[PDB]
Write a protein that holds these residues in place. Structure first.
Motif, PDB file in Angstrom:
ATOM      1  N   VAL A 281       1.001  -1.198   0.241  1.00 34.65           N
ATOM      2  CA  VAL A 281      -0.301  -0.183   0.127  1.00 34.65           C
ATOM      3  C   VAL A 281       1.102   1.660   0.203  1.00 34.65           C
TER       4      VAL A 281
ATOM      5  N   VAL B 203      -8.535 -17.521  -5.520  1.00 30.62           N
ATOM      6  CA  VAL B 203      -9.656 -16.486  -5.391  1.00 30.62           C
ATOM      7  C   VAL B 203      -9.172 -14.669  -4.086  1.00 30.62           C
TER       8      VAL B 203
ATOM      9  N   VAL C 107      -1.105  -4.392   2.396  1.00 34.15           N
ATOM     10  CA  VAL C 107      -1.073  -4.504   0.943  1.00 34.15           C
ATOM     11  C   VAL C 107      -2.269  -5.015   0.571  1.00 34.15           C
ATOM     12  N   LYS C 108      -2.585  -4.294  -1.052  1.00 35.04           N
ATOM     13  CA  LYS C 108      -3.660  -3.907  -1.521  1.00 35.04           C
ATOM     14  C   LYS C 108      -3.866  -5.626  -2.939  1.00 35.04           C
ATOM     15  N   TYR C 109      -4.575  -6.482  -3.267  1.00 34.42           N
ATOM     16  CA  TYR C 109      -4.253  -7.117  -3.727  1.00 34.42           C
ATOM     17  C   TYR C 109      -5.709  -6.767  -5.301  1.00 34.42           C
TER      18      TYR C 109
ATOM     19  N   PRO D   6      -7.186 -12.836  -2.736  1.00 35.08           N
ATOM     20  CA  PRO D   6      -6.788 -12.303  -1.119  1.00 35.08           C
ATOM     21  C   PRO D   6      -8.026 -11.724  -0.611  1.00 35.08           C
ATOM     22  N   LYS D   7      -8.258 -11.545   1.269  1.00 32.92           N
ATOM     23  CA  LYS D   7      -8.574  -9.975   1.862  1.00 32.92           C
ATOM     24  C   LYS D   7      -6.973  -9.142   1.700  1.00 32.92           C
ATOM     25  N   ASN D   8      -7.559  -7.758   1.923  1.00 31.59           N
ATOM     26  CA  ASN D   8      -6.361  -6.917   1.803  1.00 31.59           C
ATOM     27  C   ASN D   8      -5.789  -6.679   3.344  1.00 31.59           C
ATOM     28  N   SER D   9      -4.512  -6.826   3.795  1.00 30.39           N
ATOM     29  CA  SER D   9      -3.918  -6.913   5.160  1.00 30.39           C
ATOM     30  C   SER D   9      -3.586  -4.782   5.455  1.00 30.39           C
TER      31      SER D   9
ATOM     32  N   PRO E 292       3.143  -3.218  -8.333  1.00 27.35           N
ATOM     33  CA  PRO E 292       3.045  -4.277  -7.529  1.00 27.35           C
ATOM     34  C   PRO E 292       4.631  -5.216  -7.414  1.00 27.35           C
TER      35      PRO E 292
END
Lengths: 60, 60, 60, 60, 60
Positions: free
Chosen positions: B27, B41, B49-51, B43-46, B33
């Motif tokens: 982020v 799938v 980090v951004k997916y 993944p959900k953002n931490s 990237p």
């Protein structure tokens, strides 16, 4: 100055007397650089190879 | 499915089950990237980090 | 658009004007949001806090 | 010395300090490394993280 | 069913007959698991070892 390399997560401190950053494109695709670094003078475009230069830090 | 590698001029053919391509960003830098490939799938953002994921051939 | 709230299992329809879902954390502890919701535009990190956003239903 | 950095398709020449290249693997997958770089000394395997080091140009 | 694993950014398609994801903790630290994955039956908590089990995808 500081210019990006090919994977622009990474950067270079430009040696003496290169104060331009560049991106080399191939004419097929002007959105995807195949080379990045520092340069003295922006080279001229050729039939298949285009360049864009700039002078801020990591502008490329 | 075909997806781009980190150097996005290259690609790989995603194995079976993995029908998404993704870019992974820190982020702190959303321009470029740290990771590119295939996933099953998005993944959900931490916190750091951004997916971003897409389904088209080389969409990433 | 729909975004999850803090507690797992619950979510809401974002109002008019907010087209992102987001998550907020304190640096002290990055596994556990202290905000989770809808928002208009992704805040930029300031002291002691990390934010991350996304633009798909329940992406957060 | 020259080592791959991050991905097999990118590289840098090492600083003065560092005279090995490394690959770092997660134990879950000992085929694709997550990181690759230059390093001074080969770090030590955890239960979750393996390293392989070497001293030829882009040996990693 | 798909369950999270211990190594980060790793998952498993649970083989046949395991329809539970779990997490195992040492009783001294309930914030860091030491086992994460698929299982048949939620083990009973013990003196030193604790479990939590769930059964939607990547719920652990």
């Amino acid at each position: 100055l500081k210019c990006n390399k090919l994977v622009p997560l990474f950067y270079k401190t430009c040696p003496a007397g290169k104060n331009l950053c560049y991106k080399m494109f191939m004419v097929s695709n002007l959105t995807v650089p195949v080379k990045r670094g520092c340069i003295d003078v922006c080279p001229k475009n050729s039939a298949l190879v285009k360049y864009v230069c700039c002078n801020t830090d990591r502008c490329n």
